[PDB]
Amino acid sequence: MNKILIITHTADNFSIDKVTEYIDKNGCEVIRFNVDEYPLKNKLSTTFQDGKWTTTLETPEKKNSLEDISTVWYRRAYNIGHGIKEELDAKFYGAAMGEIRNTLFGFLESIDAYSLGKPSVYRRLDSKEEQLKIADKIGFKIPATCVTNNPEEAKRFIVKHRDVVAKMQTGFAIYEDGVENVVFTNVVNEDKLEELDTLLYCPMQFQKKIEKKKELRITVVGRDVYAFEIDSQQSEAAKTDWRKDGINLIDKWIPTELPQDIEFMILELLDVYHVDYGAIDMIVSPEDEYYFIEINAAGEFFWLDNLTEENRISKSIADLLCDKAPRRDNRVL
Amino acid sequence: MNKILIITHTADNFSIDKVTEYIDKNGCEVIRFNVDEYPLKNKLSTTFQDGKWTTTLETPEKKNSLEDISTVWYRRAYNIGHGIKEELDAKFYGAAMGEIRNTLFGFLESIDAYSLGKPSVYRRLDSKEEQLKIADKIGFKIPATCVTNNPEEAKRFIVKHRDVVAKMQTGFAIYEDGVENVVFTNVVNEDKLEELDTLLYCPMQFQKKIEKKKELRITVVGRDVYAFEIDSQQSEAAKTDWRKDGINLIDKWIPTELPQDIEFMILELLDVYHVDYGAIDMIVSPEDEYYFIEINAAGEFFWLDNLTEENRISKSIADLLCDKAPRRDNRVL
């Protein structure tokens, strides 16, 4: 009876499958709004008539009304308006896509039922600087960081910390010389130090390189914490032991358990943001100190959910969406 | 003395000169951040090292420390990255602009001091649907509304509501013959209900045409409320959209006083959104009914501010930024 709106795209049908199964068992209905099919293949309408609001969604599969949904789960959209480019003249394309995106994001904002994801929240989480500042305030250890377009500032930072990686806040890729080239986080060496003057045209995020003893991915669904680790140290050690030949669990994340202080601070980070989903990246140095790297509000979880027993993260998300788990209530009034 | 960071652009002195003058008269320093010149003509650096955060905005004449500011005013962010297109090779331009925008707006979001405007907040208030829903919940009278890409839903709305105007949620200029054409609010020709075919390719917002006895613009600064009125129905061009004759009507605005219930509801709107600035557009119909039309989270105020005596709205903004007026405190931890 209880209806749960889920925003996805057509290519993602796999991680949502187990969540939908567990919601079905929980006794709620799932309404799938595939976002790439808007506005071409779906039709959405919100109306205010005679003092009443009504929102209806027409799909190739079903026709539903949405003004009475119990919750919404907005998985961040990256491709809306598929096919509009071929249908509309060039002079109208930018404005039409702007209006489409604004109408849809505005509907998603207007939902006053409990929301797991919203456009303004995702936009707030795009600020990696605020992530680092908040994590430092909570008590997380974070790497030395310099976000800058100042060549002299970056050079001073690099000569000070002596082992610096450089990353963009938004990636880049290009097909050239017969092959795809992607930008990766890499150390600033003597060769790249020559091109530091070009920083004037676009900033970069420099960070002290944390030596990896462990790498951690932490998926948080409400107050459910799932930690996974890659033990680089023990992997490299096993590569010397002949008894470990052919056993390459070294490249696979294994479930692990966090120190209770780290988990407390993770839950506090989600409390400060007032969101019920998070994907946190951490690095454990050789000195066994935990470094926060970033939190992704839209991070994928299926690859690690398949490493749990019968998709525990999907069950967590389903219980959260059906109001069968403690929530950070974000209903609008 | 306290430092007030003002996010603006080089073509925006017209709205910030008086605010800067009154801030200086209040005893606080103004740090102007022109974002056209980022990152070409000024340098922005944020560093965390040795447990300390620093932020430096370096212009060719002055280095400003931003980590100890007491307030930021997100006023305008026009033409970020101006001049980069002529510096960078074309293959890097879009990605470099994405990175520049992410860095700038992420610094803006990461300011934990009191903020009059932030990216996440402005983008939440981009949702006109949530605006109308929250206004209806507060008690405002709003026009009958249908936002959709579904032609038959629009047809039903247009036949049930006979006098209906069409509206875009976003602003956009389309270039034809080097001419900039735009889409005002236009009444929907009730025979022209063919050609709503087009509605599938891009949605639109239809509303019951409200007859305009007068039109109101209400600028709210904290708890200060400056209401102005205009008679729109004396220009056949400005009769459906006063902005269509705006430059002629720009000095015909008259100060007005709202009924106390309308003012209480406007203050309650700003309380619900938890912002200290707003530009609310309303329409008073011949039957003396006050209709909420829109709230602009970053609307213009200078042309009404110049109709007061000695720029009262700029003075109120300066007092709010210098913490001499009650705030809806939004500091982060």
Binding site: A166, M168, F172, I174, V179, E180, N181, V182, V183, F184, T185, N186, K192, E195, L196, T198, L199, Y201, C202, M204 | E87, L88, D89, F92, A95, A96, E99
Partner: peptide
């Protein structure tokens, strides 16, 4: 010209 991140392009 080229931005700084262009110096971090790698194969695949």
């Amino acid at each position: 010209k080229e931005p700084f991140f262009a110096a971090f392009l790698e194969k695949q």
